Amino acid sequence: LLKLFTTMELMRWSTLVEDYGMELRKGSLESPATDVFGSTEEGEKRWKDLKNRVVEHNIRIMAKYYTRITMKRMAQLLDLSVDESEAFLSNLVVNKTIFAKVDRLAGIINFQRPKDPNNLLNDWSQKLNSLMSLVNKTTHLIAKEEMIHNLQ
Amino acid sequence: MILDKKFHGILDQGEGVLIIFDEPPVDKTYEAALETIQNMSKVVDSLYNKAKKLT
Amino acid sequence: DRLQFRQPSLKRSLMPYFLLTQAVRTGNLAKFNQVLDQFGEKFQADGTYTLIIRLRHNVIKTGVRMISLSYSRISLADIAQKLQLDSPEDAEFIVAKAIRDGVIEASINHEKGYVQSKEMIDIYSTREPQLAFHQRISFCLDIHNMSVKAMRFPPKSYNKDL
Amino acid sequence: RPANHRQLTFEEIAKSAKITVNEVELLVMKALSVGLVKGSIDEVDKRVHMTWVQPRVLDLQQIKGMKDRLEFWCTDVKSMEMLVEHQAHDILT
Amino acid sequence: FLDTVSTFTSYELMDYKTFVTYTVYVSMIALERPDLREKVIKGAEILEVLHSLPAVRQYLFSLYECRYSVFFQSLAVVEQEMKKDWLFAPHYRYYVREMRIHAYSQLLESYRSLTLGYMAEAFGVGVEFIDQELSRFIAAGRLHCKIDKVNEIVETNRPDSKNWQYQETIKKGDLLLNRVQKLSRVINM
Amino acid sequence: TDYAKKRGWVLGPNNYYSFASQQQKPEDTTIPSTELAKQVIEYARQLEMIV
Amino acid sequence: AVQKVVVHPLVLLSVVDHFNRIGKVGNQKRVVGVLLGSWQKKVLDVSNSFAVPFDEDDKDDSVWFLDHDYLENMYGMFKKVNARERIVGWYHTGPKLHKNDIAINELMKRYCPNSVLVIIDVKPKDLGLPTEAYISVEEVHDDGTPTSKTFEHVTSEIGAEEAEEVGVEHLLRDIKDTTVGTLSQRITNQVHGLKGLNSKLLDIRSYLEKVATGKLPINHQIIYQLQDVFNLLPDVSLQEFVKAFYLKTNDQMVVVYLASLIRSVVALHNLINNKIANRDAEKKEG
């Protein structure tokens, strides 16, 4: 639950394979795991759509960061084929991936670098940066100027 | 459909590169050009009044 | 040519010169060379034939400037035979004489023997615009601002007597 | 390095941390997961661009450099104030 | 010609079929695709009078469909029919060139880069002719930006919107500058 | 020989190399902003001088 | 708790009265006045105030003299004539924050609610804003120092509601209103560099002095955020902002076309009347 809470670090599910296996083996708690796998197809849909759900959720988490994870290398670190990653993109087109940038020559994707209208985006960033430097520069300047008065 | 201007896009044959772009500030050059065209008649009519009163 | 002016004086003045001033762009050396002196009476009888004797060999420079306005790659038979100049040395030599002028832009490269050129005539749109039309803004504001002086002073010359 | 091509590469991170090139993505991912840095790099070839960070301990070369860049900023603002205000006060007032 | 609903066979000046045959040139050439789709394609008049001659339907659906392989094979009828007319002959040079540059701007509008294979197969003509065609239409035609042949591929940029949309007024700025110089010439005399 | 001491360029493997060609770095846009500020000063001057 | 405060100029003109009713005695110390306001709403609004006889000692700083009966009588009568305003805090005219201010403020922390502190200057030579709202709240420090009274700067604005604007505007007859255009803009654009130059230049000198010649911890922890925010603008290369200079310079071109074209329209009546009036008055004068 803590790994699924937030800031999901890219980890291998093989460590979770034995966790789920012993989750089916031990009967002290969470016993009805065989009842979760009761149906021949329902448990398979919950498992495939479960690993799919976390392999999409971690993409939704790393999509906030603009670090350019270079999903071409990520497909190599995840040890999976690029075809089911294109199917994952087929899940992203319904997952509202409209804010993205792809490349015809290479395979690197970009979740940022829009047309960047200078009257809205650079306007906003320059407003928060310049104004934040102005008022933040204003607070501790005279605040420290009042802190040095106690030395007399 | 690009010739019909239903969306922003352009095709390609040699490279097949797709580019999508737009130009939001449309209301600037329209009003400016209309001010220039409307002021042309103002300056020309001024030259008609002065050319009439002089020669 | 004469486009916006309608008067039956520049027409008759330009009638003998019209055939050659239209023959400049096509740039045929041997034919138009005989066409000039053929019926040439007044424009060559104007005196010392200086700028027309410069034009007789400027036809090829305006033609190779039209080649600069044309595609980049220069062939040895098609465009060389088209320019009435079929030889490898004087082709790159005279084209280089057009490159040393500075009015055009080309990329002199020799890989297999063909002479290429980048011929980038792209305008300053999204290419250093501030430095491009900076002097345009300064100069236009100077002329329009001295025109503002030219609309401030004449009112003083109006209210001077009253 | 406060200025003069802040942009960097993963070679210094992997060289200083004796780690392979496959783990630097998890390293910067953990660096962004802690929350002490907000750096987002729009690179294509591997590069390391950083953002706001707090020393939190001490820096004397940044105190002296703070006096250098601070005095430089102050004398530049003063130079622009005397330059613009010099003729501006005489022609506009 | 928008009032063609109320028009009728006028034996005095021109027959109705001759009025349609004469207005199909100014309408077919002098109008773009939105103007045709709004005026004539939406209107039922050309839908009524297209059944008289099957050629006009070919010159409208082939031009609107951008099929040059049949438009150039059938264009000889427009060339021969364009001349030998009372009032329509001396203008035969303008309709040809204007229609060719209009079609080249139509196809070249939605296309940024164009190889010589798809172009030669689309138009059904040799490359040696389109070479001098576009070569003459760069300076003479003045339709788009400079063309390059470093890769033997028609590749244009057309930066005519962002900066040139604002630069369309600089001509009126310079002519208005000379006109206010004339305004300075009116001063004192 | 004379052009090696006159031009002072590099001599490669039977080829003439060309350096310092379109290698100039563009401006930092700081100085033209200062001269634009001076131009604004001249705009307040000439636009509002007689007043 | 409180984001901003509103201080009317009536209390500062009552400090002008503090400097008027001195009587030329030679003391001119930090006379403490009882600040009044409206603590009901989240924003603080000072309407008026009064004073209390306050005298300190020359050598010992811990000496402070206040009065409870005078405060309850002036506050009782003032509440009887106007019950919409109650006690909030106090203020001293001294330019320096002394150590005894924790004991002076502590009395109005016990008897009265949380009092705000305002430091002003005895001589109106400071170009900056004379009013600084300092809230009296105890804050936890990270270094481990014991919890003590901390004066955090709260932003302040000087505004008048209905009448004081009219009275000030009538008494001055020299100040100008907003008056958007050439003069009110170009004056700010001329003197603003001195408005930041005297502040920064006046602060970084004593700051750099207390860097090397400083002890008695001055909260060096906030200096890391100081130099951090100062290093949050590491001389951007302006590469991405070029297109923004094309946008702002394109708006500049729009102002060029508007000025040239509109002024060219204004030249009509002048460059017509100059002729039709002069030639007709001349031909009809005699």
Swiss-Prot record, chain A:
Modification sites for N6-acetyllysine: K64
PCI domain boundaries: 1-116
Functional summary from the UniProt entry: Component of the 26S proteasome, a multiprotein complex involved in the ATP-dependent degradation of ubiquitinated proteins. This complex plays a key role in the maintenance of protein homeostasis by removing misfolded or damaged proteins, which could impair cellular functions, and by removing proteins whose functions are no longer required. Therefore, the proteasome participates in numerous cellular processes, including cell cycle progression, apoptosis, or DNA damage repair.
UniProt record similarity statement: Belongs to the proteasome subunit p55 family.
Disease: Stankiewicz-Isidor syndrome: A neurodevelopmental disorder characterized by delayed psychomotor development, intellectual disability, behavioral disorders, mild dysmorphism, ophthalmologic anomalies, feeding difficulties, deafness, and variable congenital malformations of the cardiac and/or urogenital systems.
Subunit description: Component of the 19S proteasome regulatory particle complex. The 26S proteasome consists of a 20S core particle (CP) and two 19S regulatory subunits (RP). The regulatory particle is made of a lid composed of 9 subunits including PSMD12, a base containing 6 ATPases and few additional components. Interacts with ERCC6.
Protein name: 26S proteasome non-ATPase regulatory subunit 12
Gene source species: Homo sapiens (Human)
Gene: PSMD12
From Swiss-Prot, chain D:
Signal peptide: none
Residues that bear N6-acetyllysine: K15
Transmembrane segments: none
Subunit structure and binding partners: Component of the 19S proteasome regulatory particle complex. The 26S proteasome consists of a 20S core particle (CP) and two 19S regulatory subunits (RP). The regulatory particle is made of a lid composed of 9 subunits including PSMD13, a base containing 6 ATPases and few additional components.
Function: Component of the 26S proteasome, a multiprotein complex involved in the ATP-dependent degradation of ubiquitinated proteins. This complex plays a key role in the maintenance of protein homeostasis by removing misfolded or damaged proteins, which could impair cellular functions, and by removing proteins whose functions are no longer required. Therefore, the proteasome participates in numerous cellular processes, including cell cycle progression, apoptosis, or DNA damage repair.
Family: Belongs to the proteasome subunit S11 family.
Protein name as annotated: 26S proteasome non-ATPase regulatory subunit 13
Organism name: Homo sapiens
Gene name for this UniProt entry: PSMD13
Entire protein: shown range: 284 to 376 of 376
UniProtKB/Swiss-Prot annotation, chain E:
Source domain of life: Eukaryota
Positions of the PCI domain: 1-161
Similarity remark: Belongs to the proteasome subunit S10 family.
Oligomeric form and interacting partners: Component of the 19S proteasome regulatory particle complex. The 26S proteasome consists of a 20S core particle (CP) and two 19S regulatory subunits (RP). The regulatory particle is made of a lid composed of 9 subunits including PSMD6, a base containing 6 ATPases and few additional components.
Function, in words: Component of the 26S proteasome, a multiprotein complex involved in the ATP-dependent degradation of ubiquitinated proteins. This complex plays a key role in the maintenance of protein homeostasis by removing misfolded or damaged proteins, which could impair cellular functions, and by removing proteins whose functions are no longer required. Therefore, the proteasome participates in numerous cellular processes, including cell cycle progression, apoptosis, or DNA damage repair.
Protein name: 26S proteasome non-ATPase regulatory subunit 6
Species assigned in the record: Homo sapiens (Human)
Residues shown, of full length: 201 to 389 of 389
Curated annotation (Swiss-Prot), chain F:
Domain of life: Eukaryota
Subunit structure: Component of the 19S proteasome regulatory particle complex. The 26S proteasome consists of a 20S core particle (CP) and two 19S regulatory subunits (RP). The regulatory particle is made of a lid composed of 9 subunits including PSMD8, a base containing 6 ATPases and few additional components. Interacts with DDI2. Interacts with TASOR.
Homology family: Belongs to the proteasome subunit S14 family.
Protein name in UniProt: 26S proteasome non-ATPase regulatory subunit 8
Organism, as annotated: Homo sapiens
Function in brief: Component of the 26S proteasome, a multiprotein complex involved in the ATP-dependent degradation of ubiquitinated proteins. This complex plays a key role in the maintenance of protein homeostasis by removing misfolded or damaged proteins, which could impair cellular functions, and by removing proteins whose functions are no longer required. Therefore, the proteasome participates in numerous cellular processes, including cell cycle progression, apoptosis, or DNA damage repair.
